[PDB]
Structures are given as C-alpha cells and as structure tokens.
Symmetry: D2
C-alpha cells in the first residue's frame, strides 16, 4: 500500500549487459566517464577510487544528470564488488613522477598500486578487457598484463592513440582540412620517443612524402618535423597552462571504448605486446595499429618502417625492457 | 609551390552559422563546453575568461580532441572579438561571496563584473540569446537583462532546470522508473526557496498526489518532502564531497542549448521575467515552465499553484526586488 | 604470403557470438523502416533480416550493407532460413499481410495467425532467450498469439501497441498548442485500432492538467472539439494508406523507440500490448496497450492508470472487442 | 479564453526565417531515404519535400510528421509549389526520368533536361543562395545540366558522383580484410557507375599502401584478383536493382554524409562530382568525381590526386563521352 505499489504492478523481480568501470576519478578518469556517458556506450558505469568523499561526490554529480543520459545505472565504491561483470575496465589511477624521482622507482610505485587494483578487478570481472591509460602507459600495460594473467588480446594501453589524434589535428590546421580527412600515424613509445611515420601521411590517398620528398627531414623548408615536435610538447604545454590534460584523453579513450563495446574492428594505434616484430625479442608493449573489437586486440597491422624508424622502436623496446627487468612483482 | 598548394587546388577564398560562446572557463564553464561539443550543437565554440593561461590551456586540450568531434573551430581569448556572431552566449563567470559580505554587496560586485562582460558580448553578437548560469541566477539574469538592453525573450537564466532534473532523478530512484518517464517541476527561485509543485508530479499522467494525498506534507509516512530537501541540499553535499559541482549543470545547460539552437519549442523551467503573474508586480525573474526556441523564450506556461506555493513565489519576488532596487548600474 | 597476411598479423582466430543482435522478420516497408531506424540509432552489433521472398530479401540486405561506412553495425545478414537469426536479443516481427485502403486491421487476423504459426516456432527455436517485439497487425491479437505459441513468459512478448497512437496524439496536441510533442503529455490506450481510448484525464503540459483547465475536454459539448484529435489519431493510418499506399516511417521510429528502451535497459514507460488481466476487473487473458516499464527483460511492470468512469468503460469496450476475437483462436 | 490561452502566455509573435533548412526534391525511394537519413542525423531545423504527385507527397509528409516525437526536426513541410522550399541552405535533387526500354542515353538525358528546366529555376527563385546537391542519374551529366540552368557558381553545384561508389569499394575492401570500412581507405573517382576509376595507389590501411605491399594490385595478372573488388562496385548496384527493383538506403546514407559536411562546415574530403575543366588534360565543361573539401560554401577546394597515365586516359575518355552527349542537349 506504498505509493510505489499503488502506482506500479510488478511482474518481475529481476546483471548488466554492457558495463564499463573507470578506476580513478581524477581529471582523466572523469573525462573518460563523461565522454563514455555522452556516447551511450554503457548500460551501467561504475567508478572506483580510494578517496571516498571525492568518489561519492563525482558519482552523485553524474547521477544528477541522468535525465540527460541513456545510462540507467551509475555506481561507485572503494570496494571492487561494484565493478562486477564489467565488459571493459579503464585504469587511470596511479602515481605521478615526483621531483628527484627516477623512472624505475616511479614505475615500481605504480606496480605496487596495480598489485592492489588489478587482482580486485580480475576477481569481479574475470573476462573483461583492461584498458590502461595511466602513465607511463607502455610499461604500465606490461605491468597490468603480468599481474592480471590475462591473454595479451585483453590488455590494451591507450598508447599513441591521442598522439596520433594530435598529429592529425595539427596536420589539418596546416592544410585547411578536417582531421577526419587527414591521415597519419604516430607509433612506438608514447611520449618523447614516439615515431611519426612520414610514409603513411596522406589526404585522400595522396602520399605527402611522395609529393614532397624532404618531408620530415632536416632539409625540409616547411619544417614538417616540427609537427611531431608539437605533438610531443603540446602535452607539456597544456600541463604548463591549465595544470594537467584531460579532455582530449577522455575523448580518445571513449573512441577506443566505442570500438571495443560495439565490436567495430576499427584500427587504432594502441599499446600492445610487440615481441616478434621489428627485431624485438623482449616482452614489451608499444603502439602499432591494432584492430579493436569485442575480444580486445584481435589483429595487428604490420606497418612498413624505414631502418631509422625501426631502430627507434628497437631502442625504445630495449629501454622499456631494461626498466621492466628491474621491477619487483 | 608549397606542399599544400601541390596537394590542394583552391576554388574559394571566402562566417559561422551556429556559434556558441561560453564566458568563464571554471569547472562549470568547461562542463558546459564539453557537453555542447559532444552534442554537436555548434559549428564554432568560443571561450572567454580573464585568466589567459588557463584559458589557452583549456582551448588547446579541447582542440586536441577535434578528431573525435564535429565542431571544426574552437577559439579563445581575453578579447571578446573571438565571440563575434554567436547565436548563443552562455555566462558562467561571477563573484564568490566573502565572509561577512552582504548578499546585496555580492550582487553589486556581480553587476560591476557584468558591466564589463555584457557590453562586450553585445558589441560582437548584438542578436545572440544570453543564457545566464552564474549564481545567484535569478538576480543575475535580471542584471544581464538590464545591462544588455535585450528584449526579455533573449535573456534566459538556467534557473530551476537542474533542480527539476535532480527532482526527477530522485523520483525515478524511488519508483524504479527512468527520470525521462518521471515528471515533476521545481519552480520559483533557484536554491533553498524553490517550490516543488506536488500537483504536477506524475508517471504516465497518473498524479502521485491523487493516489497519496499526504504527498509532500509532514503527515507523509514516506516523507516525500525529503526529496525536495535533497534537491535543495544536493549542490551543498556535492560541494562538500568533491569541492564544487559541474557535470550535472553542464548537461542541463547543454539541454537548454539544444532547444534554443534547434528551435525545438520544448518546455523547460528557466528564469524569466515574471511580472504580471501570481500577483507579482516588480521586474523580477523566477523560474516557470518556458517554451524555448530560436528566439529564446517565446511563451510561458501558467502553472496553477496552491495558496502556499503562490505565497512562496511572492515572498521570493519581494526578496529579489528588495535587493534589485538597491543596485547601482 | 597473401596481401592480407603481409598486412595483418592475426592474434585471435575464434569469432564470438554478437552481444546485441537484433532480427527483423519481414522486409516490407514496415520492416525496412524498422531496420534503418535501428541502424541509425546504434542499437545493434548485428542485424539479421528474414523473409520468404529471397530476391527482395537479398537486395535489401545488400543495399544496407553498402551503407556500412556510415553506420556502426558491423554485421548485417539475411536469409529465408531462420538459422540466420540465432542468438538474437530482440526479434521484431513485422511480416504478414497489411491493411489495404479502407480495410480494418482486424480483417488481417486469419492470414497473420496462420503466418505466425510458422514464424514464431522458428524464432523461438534459434533465439530461446530473446524478447519478441510484435509489430504485425492486428498487433494486440498477434501479441497474444505469439505469447501462446512461443511459450515465453509474458514479460518477453511485447506488442508495439499504442506507442505510435500516443506519438500521433502528442504530435496533434503539439500542433494545437504550439509546443514540441516531447513536452505534450497524453496517452492513448487499448486497441491499436478503431477502439483505442484517449485518456483525457491524464493530458498535461508541464504537469498542468488540461481537463482541470478545460472541464469539457474530450466531450461532445467541448466548443474546441478536442475529440477530433483522437478521431484523427484513429483515422491516421487509413489517411496515409489512402495517400501513399502504406505507412512506414512513423511505425519504424516507434518500434526503434521501444527497441532502444529494451536494448539499453532504460525502464522508460511506454503503452505497449500486454496481458491486462487483473486490471479494471478484467478476468480474461486479453492483450491490449497500457503503460508498461520496458527494459532488458521486456515488460517488468505495469503502470496502474486511474481512469474516469467513461475512460474505463471505453477501455473495457476495447478489451471486449479484442477478447471476442482472441478467445476464438485455436492452438 | 481558449484552452491554449489559459495554459500559455505568449511573449512573441515570430515570423522567423528558417536557419538550417534542407529541401529534398522528389519523394521516390531515393528522396525519402535521403529524408529519413537527414532526419535521424539531426542535420536540419526544417525539412521541405517537393514533388509533382500530390497525394503521395502529402502521405510521405504526414508519415514523417507522425514520428516527430522521435525526432529533433520541429518543422516538416511539403507541397507541389516551390514556395515551401524558401531559404533552404541545401537543396537535394532526386527527381527525374528513368531510362526506358530501348531508350538512348541522349534521349534519356534530354527528358531530364526538360524536367530540370522546371525544377531548377523554381529552386533558385526561392533559395538563390543554396547549395545544390544533385543525386538524380545519370548524375555527372545532370549536375552539368543543373549548373547550366541555375547559373550558380560551380562551388555551389555538387553531384553525389562517386561518393557511394567509394563507400561500396570500402565496404568490399573491409569484407576482404576483416576491417571496418572506416579504417579501409580507397578512392573511386571519375564517372559514377561503369566507367569509374579505382585509384589503386591510394588504397591503404593505417597508411600502409596495399599497392606497395602487393604490386600486382589492380592488374589482370593479380593472383588475388583485387580488381574484382572494383568490378563488384560496379556490378553490385545492378544486382541490387535486379533483386529489389532500385537502390535507396545506401544512397540515402551517403547523401546524408555529404549534407553533414555541408551543413556543419566540416571541410571533410568527399569524392563528389565537380566541374573539372582544366585538370588532367580535360578541356570541356564536364563534371567528374575528384576528392573535394566540402563545407558551408559547397566545394571550396579539391585534392589534386596524382594519377597514372592509364588513369588519366580513363578520365579523359569519360569527359569526351559526357561532353559528346552534353553538346547535343537543347536547353
Ligand atoms: O603498497 C602500496 O604502495 C599501495 C597499495 S594500494 C596503493 N594505492 N592505491 C591507490 C589508488 C587505487 C585506486 C585508485 F582508483 C586510486 C588510487 C593509491 C595508492 C597509494 F597512494 F600509493 F598509497 N599503494
Ligand atoms: O645497453 C645497456 O644495457 C644500457 C644502456 S643505458 C643502460 N642503463 N641506463 C640506466 C639508468 C638510466 C637513468 C637512471 F636514472 C638510472 C639508471 C642504467 C642502465 C644499466 F642497465 F644499468 F646499464 N643500460
Ligand atoms: O595528454 C598526454 O598525452 C599526457 C599527459 S601526461 C603525459 N606523459 N606522462 C609521461 C610520463 C610519466 C611518468 C613517467 F615515469 C614517464 C613518462 C610522459 C608523457 C608525455 F606523453 F610525454 F607527455 N602525456
Ligand atoms: O630514470 C630511470 O630510472 C631510468 C631511465 S632509463 C633507465 N634504464 N634504462 C635501462 C636500459 C636502457 C637500454 C638498454 F639497452 C638496456 C637497459 C635500464 C634502466 C634501469 F634499470 F631502470 F635503470 N632507468
Ligand atoms: O457516468 C459516467 O461518467 C459514465 C459512465 S460510462 C460513460 N460513458 N461511456 C461511454 C462509452 C463507452 C464505451 C464506448 F465504446 C463508447 C462510449 C460514453 C460515456 C458518456 F456518457 F459519454 F460519458 N459515462
Ligand atoms: O515539359 C515537360 O516534359 C516537363 C515539364 S516539368 C516535367 N516533369 N517534372 C516532373 C517532376 C518534377 C519534380 C519532382 F520532384 C518530380 C517530378 C515530372 C515531369 C514529367 F511530367 F514526368 F515529365 N516534365
Ligand atoms: O545506386 C547506384 O549507384 C545507382 C543507382 S541507378 C545508377 N545508375 N544510373 C545510371 C544511368 C541512368 C540513366 C542513364 F541514361 C544512364 C546511366 C547508371 C548507373 C550505374 F551507376 F551504373 F549503376 N547507379
């Protein structure tokens, strides 16, 4: 005789079918959350962090916008049981490099955090895809793969996905064309060591390198190499200006989530286990174009690289392995 | 010739059709911006604020996500020339009240702030609609109206649009129905003095007040009055938990922008000049259900209120006019 | 080494079942309008089409496939054999005879019950866990039939019902008031057909009761003749059939609206055909439209609408008409 | 007072001109597929439909209006009189004569000229600043016809051209490679249909040239017969026509993609038909497809694709063939 019962005759006393979890509710985690919500990718969104008030506040702020969304359940908690049955778990938590801190010790601190996060995630969603966004993303994708025990197709790092998107943005600005119609790939290690593959840059299938052979070289009077320099530094420039980056990474991560959740088999440059390619013999993750879908990475595109490009990926792999073999799991 | 000229033959060396400006790039302003971008409402987005570094960093972060959007131009600056020819200008900038500072003094500081912002907006977009999101929104909508010289249809306050969305969310939680199918209106002055119109709360046209006469009274065993208390205290609780609120207000503003930009003539509870209704005789703005379209507010719905509800709106109007008549423009 | 081999290194060999497959049965105008609407709303990762006319079927499938670049549904299949429908979450039935000019939907019963005797066991055979969404006419009777033949629990057998009649009512309401239909609220319940019931006592804008403002609303004495709005709703399909030969776009959008609530588990309320036994003192197993909560398990709840004496009498008249047919069917 | 005036206080009497209006001319299968695709992509705040068959036109308009609840395009209008199209940003022409048994290409085009002599001036009268998007076949010649009659500058007269051929090519390429067509790049240029030119040099996934990986790509001696993909781009259209009677859905989706770039000023590149005199040794006023930057002023720029000698010869032969017909037309 409650109001609910006077109004509603229940037929069914009835698990989520398209659930995504975001771990970490810093600026990056919440940018991923809002972008996923506005793209209607999930029927349930779970948020996890260790700061309880901030977590609850973010969950409530999203819930209050429910009228404008098509995601009918948003939940959160410090307890990983709220993440149960996720198709996709996006990891954005972890430690930032501090003053005086080595890359090795920063990574070790993140190993120690992932040793708590990842087994809890795996416990409640043993068949999920893990999408690692935390930096340094290539090494932390390896760390998540090692700790989770997942097959390599289900452990994906966001890698050079945004680097590539920035590259196409800058390309489009130079040419006066939408980035959607400007094509070009940044591969390898995310960050300062990434590799712009000049041979693949094109508009409508017309090779810029063929039209303009000095493209990307020191002799280039248009200094197109400065485009890749800008890609590397634009992250730093945004951090210097507003303190951090968030929006572009959130959009780029939602794009990856779309391909996975909707089984699109679109090709994205993400970090994946690259052993066996380009002379690399160690268990390291680097960005190459991957086909993304329901089972994670199902296929790799084998981009033809020059000797110099290949040597740069090899050099990155050697460094990554050099750090990885010193980690304590 | 340059690479561009070898690649591209230009036919035309020829103004935005659907431009939106957001003034203020704090958390609320940026939530409005990302929500508008992800809803494909604008062909150009302009951001303005007085903090030049933050401003440029936010613009760049959004620009870097261009590949994932359908808004081909994002601009920013401290100079309002970047806002030229906007259809819709959303104001989120304003003062924060100081300890010991009277409400009157606070509003006067907002007046002085708007005496800079609004004339510069009007210079560059004389035919825009103004959407005021800054709190205290009902008074500041009056202030924008007076300073702009705009007809009242083109000056809209976000008002109780989000309070009503929160109400419907809470209603939906109690009933197990999506908020889209839970109907109910919070009207009047945004904040603690707002009015939940119990007579209008329904699912599928079934009045809850009819089924449950004690609805919203102190005699209510189900304590539905707590739902409106929760609405009123929501921003408070979220601010206490995470420091501020942003996502819900961004989504609600993007919903208002959708009706305006697409000429939908949907009904929203927004703040509008209410002189002539409910025995109100002064130039005050409060929320009532308004028809929103390409000319702003073209019509408003005359909601039948109980004597108590009417008295509350009247008391709010008296309080608003008491402050407004002391303002120096 | 083939070109594909040189270009792509494969990690995973095994293809998996789709997560969100939808089947549309029947590729007439209604079925194809449902298909394009569902495709453009991104509700499925696989769309299957089934019909008995093989050329037309293959042609429609290819036409949609050629638009794949512009869609986000990576697999579209078709076949006369129902094995192409396996593992569907939602199966939308649009097949069967349709109304000619001036013809009642009720005139289609014999033809479409006989088609359903073939279709429904084949659907259930390949997707035993699907939700059935019945669109073929007369939709209320055929929803009862699909429920009886399938042996499904009634929550998983949903008729498109009066979702469309209510959409038309709200459109006409919006035209009269100068308000978008989204903000005009009014329900048409009962048969999707001539005996439908407008619930005047529930109509409102912004929670303001129109019958309270206008006590003659929906009566013969009404100086504004709002009954004409419901009369236009009843006559809509006839008028469109007379003009263009059939209806398609509005029903396609109505069905996609229902599919969205089901596939995304929204628990939005829609007037759809379901068993109303136990409401308004009705004891028969009659199916007709009342507001239902719709989600991933189909109909999980009924909203109990308070009707005036006249509205309830009209709804019971509608139920008597439909039950007079449904009771005589033989399974 | 009326119920409306009791309920609603009016602030504004608005005589306001459409801000984002699209007109579709012709309400056959192609025109209505363009209409529904545009509606479900929210590209327009007003949609106008025009044709000469009045009952069919009214029926289509009503069927779309009845689905308004499910749309975000608040005004849908129609009429045989072109005053309903006034102030359109974009006018899509799908109307025209269909080729009859035994009829020459010249006679078919001339019948379309005669129809365009009615349609095009009426469009120009009411929307003198619109972009014209020609979809009627044969599209390259009728884009020329529309250009000559309208007297528009060539940036504002666009033929749908090889946009759909390229989409079909990418669908077929994706099927072969097991990759979404969004990630399979390849351009079909030149004359729409049988004489179109697949640009093998541009075919790629992730910037990896297939022709560089597989030098036989596109040739007769190719063991993998990739040339068959382009043969199927040509043949699959005829196959759809044979099987269901006509093509409609893929055209509609591809036209809505073009509309999206134009209405939202995206400056995306599309292979559309444009006046090509001065390129590739072409010296006549003919329209052929090349990659064009599309935005609010129509075609603002075009991409200069490097073609082999064989590819250039094929464009010239098409240009001679088209000009061969155009020079015989009576305007
Ligand atoms: O053994 C250790 O050092 C250890 C074990 S857990 C841990 N974690 N975990 C988080 C965390 C987890 C999830 C989030 F969503 C966000 C943050 C933060 C830390 C801390 F700051 F390093 F302490 N450290
Ligand atoms: O070719 C090799 O094996 C090789 C090439 S560089 C290298 N590096 N680099 C570092 C290092 C760098 C930065 C630090 F802050 C701290 C340590 C340490 C080593 C080493 F393995 F111990 F040798 N090894
Ligand atoms: O928005 C972006 O792309 C972004 C935001 S921070 C970032 N990071 N983070 C690291 C890093 C962090 C810790 C290490 F121990 C080592 C490296 C390097 C980069 C960069 F790509 F080079 F910029 N990138
Ligand atoms: O800042 C740091 O901690 C840091 C920065 S590079 C680094 N490296 N690098 C290598 C390496 C590199 C190349 C090789 F060919 C072989 C090994 C090994 C390490 C170390 F053990 F972690 F120290 N450490
Ligand atoms: O006393 C009352 O309020 C009352 C009780 S029944 C009633 N009804 N019922 C119908 C009706 C019923 C079924 C139809 F199929 C058609 C019409 C018409 C009326 C009315 F008189 F016009 F109001 N009114
Ligand atoms: O003098 C002539 O031959 C002539 C002059 S107008 C004409 N038109 N026009 C249309 C038409 C127009 C717009 C549509 F949207 C659809 C069709 C059809 C014909 C026709 F009768 F079939 F030939 N013919
Ligand atoms: O869906 C499509 O692509 C499509 C649908 S009809 C079509 N048409 N139309 C003609 C044509 C028509 C009249 C002529 F007088 C001459 C030619 C040729 C083609 C074709 F591309 F080769 F297939 N294409």
């Amino acid at each position: 005789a409650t109001l609910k019962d006077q109004l509603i005759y229940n037929l069914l006393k009835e698990t989520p079918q398209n659930k995504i979890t975001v771990v970490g509710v810093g600026a990056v985690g919440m940018a991923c959350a809002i972008s996923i919500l506005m793209k209607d990718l999930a029927d349930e969104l779970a948020l996890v962090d260790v700061i309880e008030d901030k977590l609850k506040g973010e969950m409530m702020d999203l819930q209050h916008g429910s009228l404008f969304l098509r995601t009918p359940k948003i939940v959160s908690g410090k307890d990983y049981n709220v993440t149960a049955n996720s198709k996709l778990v996006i990891i954005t938590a972890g430690a930032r490099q501090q003053e005086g801190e080595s890359r090795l010790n920063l990574v070790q601190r993140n190993v120690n955090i992932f040793k708590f996060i990842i087994p809890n995630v795996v416990k409640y969603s043993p068949n999920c895809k893990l999408l690692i966004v935390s930096n340094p993303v290539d090494i932390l994708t390896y760390v998540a793969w090692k700790i989770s025990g997942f097959p390599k197709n289900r452990v994906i790092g966001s890698g050079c996905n945004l680097d590539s998107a920035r590259f196409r943005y800058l390309m489009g600005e130079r040419l006066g064309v939408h980035p959607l119609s400007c094509h070009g790939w940044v591969l390898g290690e995310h960050g300062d060591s990434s590799v712009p593959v000049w041979s693949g840059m094109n508009v409508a299938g017309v090779s810029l390198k063929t039209l303009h052979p000095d493209l990307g070289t020191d002799k280039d009077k248009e200094q197109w190499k400065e485009v890749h320099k800008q890609v590397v530094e634009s992250a730093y420039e945004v951090i210097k200006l507003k303190g951090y980056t968030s929006w572009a990474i959130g959009l780029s991560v939602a794009d990856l989530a779309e391909s996975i959740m909707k089984n699109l088999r679109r090709v994205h440059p993400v970090s994946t286990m690259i052993k066996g390619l380009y002379g690399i013999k160690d268990d390291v993750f680097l960005s190459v174009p991957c086909i993304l879908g329901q089972n994670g990475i199902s296929d790799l595109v084998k981009v033809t690289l020059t000797s110099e490009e290949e040597a740069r990926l090899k050099k990155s792999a050697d460094t990554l392995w050099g750090i990885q073999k010193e980690l304590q799991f």
